[PDB]
Amino acid sequence: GSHMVLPSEAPNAKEEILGTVSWNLREMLAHAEETRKLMPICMDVRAIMATIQRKYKGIKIQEGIVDYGVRFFFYTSKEPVASIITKLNSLNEPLVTMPIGYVTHGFNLEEAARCMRSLKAPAVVSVSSPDAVTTYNGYLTSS
């Protein structure tokens, strides 16, 4: 059985956020939707996917630039952090994401942050702790 009606709504925020923040996932999906900003995601992290694909029904994982509610970019477990960054160079869109090559691909916060300066596109970053926005910003300042 099927029926799909919901409160669709129009975001109109002229503004935009920069730097790292201490958001999580739903906060991010809101701002992403709001601004139509681009969201790099890794299908590897099924925990993230089990939220997205449920918030944006009927989707059944894809690869590539996933226009599905939010503008996503689905890059593999197998593509290195410098390679996905090189790809994102062509797009050069304002992003909002978590520190990408931090945990799915086995890094540390430092190694993540360094690699992320090599991204030549704007990117709001979200760490799952406030006390780490400081640390992460610190790497972005110090390397």
Curated annotation (Swiss-Prot):
Phenotypic consequence of residue 59 to V: In strain: Isolate Shanghai QXC1
Named cofactor requirement(s): Zn(2+)
Membrane topology: Multi-pass membrane protein
Domain of life per record: Viruses
Domain (Macro) ranges: 17-143
Subcellular location: Host membrane; Host cytoplasm
Reactions mediated catalytically: Thiol-dependent hydrolysis of ester, thioester, amide, peptide and isopeptide bonds formed by the C-terminal Gly of ubiquitin (a 76-residue protein attached to proteins as an intracellular targeting signal)
Domains (record comment): The hydrophobic region HD1 probably mediates the membrane association of the replication complex.
Function: Responsible for the cleavages located at the N-terminus of the replicase polyprotein. In addition, PL-PRO possesses a deubiquitinating/deISGylating activity and processes both 'Lys-48'- and 'Lys-63'-linked polyubiquitin chains from cellular substrates. Plays a role in host membrane rearrangement that leads to creation of cytoplasmic double-membrane vesicles (DMV) necessary for viral replication. Nsp3, nsp4 and nsp6 together are sufficient to form DMV.
The protein, known as: Papain-like protease nsp3
Species the sequence originates in: Severe acute respiratory syndrome coronavirus
Range of the intact protein held here: 1331 to 1469 of 7073
